[PDB]
Amino acid sequence: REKEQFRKLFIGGLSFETTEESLRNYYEQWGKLTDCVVMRDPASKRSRGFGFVTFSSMAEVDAAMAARPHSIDGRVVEPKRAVAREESGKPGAHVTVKKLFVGGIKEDTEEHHLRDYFEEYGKIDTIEIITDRQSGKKRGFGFVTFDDHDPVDKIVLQKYHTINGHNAEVRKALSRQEM
RNA sequence: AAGGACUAG
Structure with missing residues (x-):
């Protein structure tokens, strides 16, 4: 199995209605997800409008990205290869x-x-x-x-x-x- | 539309 960073997508522009079940259901059409998360406000549990999915292989990720555009719960979502937290905040x-x-x-x-x-x-x-x-x-x-x-x-x-x-x-x- | 963590032996 490959490094998790190489299997992970950031999914931007989620509907506030989208849940981990509906995100998982959608992305599971290109492979097995080892992790699926919708980011939520800790007190209100209101969606922050993004999440992450992690596939079991990088080939699965490529298969999903070859099938853009992606839409879930009526919104065109914005998948992107996940940028490692260490890198985030560096210029560009x-x-x-x-x-x-x-x-x-x-x-x-x-x-x-x-x-x-x-x-x-x-x-x-x-x-x-x-x-x-x-x-x-x-x-x-x-x-x-x-x-x-x-x-x-x-x-x-x-x-x-x-x-x-x-x-x-x-x-x-x-x-x-x-x- | 940038990270939640059984991330304290």
């Missing part, structure tokens, strides 16, 4: 973006290496290898833009990736202000 931790920064790729990594590595995670719209305008030389990083945010969210659960023989690193692409 909860951003929703289609673009991924790939660093540590040095000077021999081309567009086609990023394509071949990343296209299993989703549909790629654009790849940009960054070069120094003056020297022409690759600067050791690039950006991969997918057609959806979910590939980016999935990829960045794992910080370190071997890419083209390098010890590469992935980050969600941020504007300078989100940084």
Whole structure:
């Protein structure tokens, strides 16, 4: 079995009517849930409008996310790979973006290496290898833009990736202000 | 629309 963080979705924009039974019933169409929670105010027990579901495998998670959009109790819900509590509060931790920064790729990594590595995670719209305008030389990083945010969210659960023989690193692409 | 905990031997 895989790490729990890799099996967990945050589910945003729940109806205040949605319960753990109705959330469980819905998400159980893509696999077994080992945990299901709707967050509630501790005194009023009023729903806070989000919860989490945890599948028995990451393949189940992927199967659910391949079947978006999701709706429960008449609301279109907003599932997202769960961001670990340690990460929450770091700059850009909860951003929703289609673009991924790939660093540590040095000077021999081309567009086609990023394509071949990343296209299993989703549909790629654009790849940009960054070069120094003056020297022409690759600067050791690039950006991969997918057609959806979910590939980016999935990829960045794992910080370190071997890419083209390098010890590469992935980050969600941020504007300078989100940084 | 960002975490509830049989999370005190």
